[PDB]
Amino acid sequence: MLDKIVIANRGEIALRILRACKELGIKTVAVHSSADRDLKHVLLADETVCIGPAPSVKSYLNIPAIISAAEITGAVAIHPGYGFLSENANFAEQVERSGFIFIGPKAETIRLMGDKVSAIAAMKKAGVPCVPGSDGPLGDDMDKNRAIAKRIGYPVIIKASGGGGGRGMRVVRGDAELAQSISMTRAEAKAAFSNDMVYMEKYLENPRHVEIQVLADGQGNAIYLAERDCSMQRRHQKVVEEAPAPGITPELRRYIGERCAKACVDIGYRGAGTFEFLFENGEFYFIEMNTRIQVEHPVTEMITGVDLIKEQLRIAAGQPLSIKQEEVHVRGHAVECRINAEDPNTFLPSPGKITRFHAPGGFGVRWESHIYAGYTVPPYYDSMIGKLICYGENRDVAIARMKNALQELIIDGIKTNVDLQIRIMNDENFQHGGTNIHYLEKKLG
């Protein structure tokens, strides 16, 4: 196994990775900012290194400080987690170049998928169904651009190639808005990503957000581990995730799944990864690929039995996948509620000290969090402070366990979205299943 690794992250995911390392007998190096000396995973790590002050640019995005920490402790690999440098190709490249293993794919694979246009071209070539679109970047010729939009059919969406999530994109519903919308998306992309390249896709009006978890090793094995529905969201921020997706038949699962596995072979993918799709009218349309472990990975683990973080560490060490595709079975159902330190009226981060904490327990209840009684949530990082994942023999049992768990959960001293999560679990449309990406925002309205 890897002897010792640097966990280049913080919070729940850093604790998640630390647990996996200890199971595997891997030594841990917890790199942390000065604000994060009292993190749960830091206090459990074999070795700790303070890599800088609170703001991320000087700590968790500080490439030299992180690599220097790996050098001085004699670590052999770096896990980026999610959300920081985890999809930074230059970082992965620099890590590989410095002599350490980057837990993830090759740097060139990271930048292929970090460029949305070329990612789409790669997937379309490999046989993955995509959104009807421009099939290339848009130029400055508005006659060409209008012809592309006519061919696609209004409404259309303009997207930044260097973009991702909700950055940066606008819907165009007629010719009259097209030129200005391309210009505005370009300007925003140039400012944000130093990449003004944009593409066009047919705008899907009411889709679901269904994504496929994959694993691929260094010995030619590539598997899919079913799907996740992530439609319960607000402004490109996932709120509830669940596995498998309601309404997806075993035969739809293998259809799209096998196509994702083949794409991995074609591109020589390595590690965990997620294929993000829009699902509408029984049809899958690829939009982007995440080349890292995701926040919502625990729901896939519950229903397959596969420890994805352990697999990442096995792959990085040159072990094959511990599971064959024929041995991957979907059993039961899992729901994840993100727990955020946020104000219920503004949805702005609400940091501060937790005065009382109690975690829920029981059969099928998994609590993924670093928080404890007396812990202070800092203002410098993301608002998500924990993940409640509940598993049942079916969807209704999973939701029923979630409601129970949410009621056992005590987090005093700070504002949370626990009451909102309770409302969603009690929502009749959610309880039916299959709600689109716009549902939560219109329920909140």
Ligand SMILES: COc1cccc(OC)c1-c1cc2cnc(N)nc2nc1N
């Ligand atoms: C995960 O998908 C979300 C999620 C929230 C909002 C949103 O667009 C307003 C989308 C979305 C919708 C889309 C609709 N059509 C399309 N071609 N691409 C899209 N890409 C998106 N990211």
